Amino acid sequence: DGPEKNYEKTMAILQIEAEKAELRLKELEVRRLMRARGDGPWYQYPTIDKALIDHSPKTTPDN
């Protein structure tokens, strides 16, 4: 095959691999930022739910 085959095809290899390369670098730093600050969808750890608590009046007043 001529050179337009391998040329445009190798372009496709490089562009796909470059976007994959930069997405990886973003993911490493995004994962770091999420684990450090915690303001993210993932890396969130379980906390006790409020609905378990009871608001009904108790025996003692001061509660």
Add this chain to the structure above:
Amino acid sequence: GWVRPDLGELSKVTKVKTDRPLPENPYHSRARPEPNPEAEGDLKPAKHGSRLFFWTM
């Protein structure tokens, strides 16, 4: 001029028409932390698939 309260009658829960204002913050609670950034958008295919090592898909 009194009446002996019947059994169970005095234990009835009752309503009191007090004019005291409601305690807005009885527990003296502070401001609460804002929720995490919520999730939105639609799920699109992962760009370049797995993107793990040499796996092209």
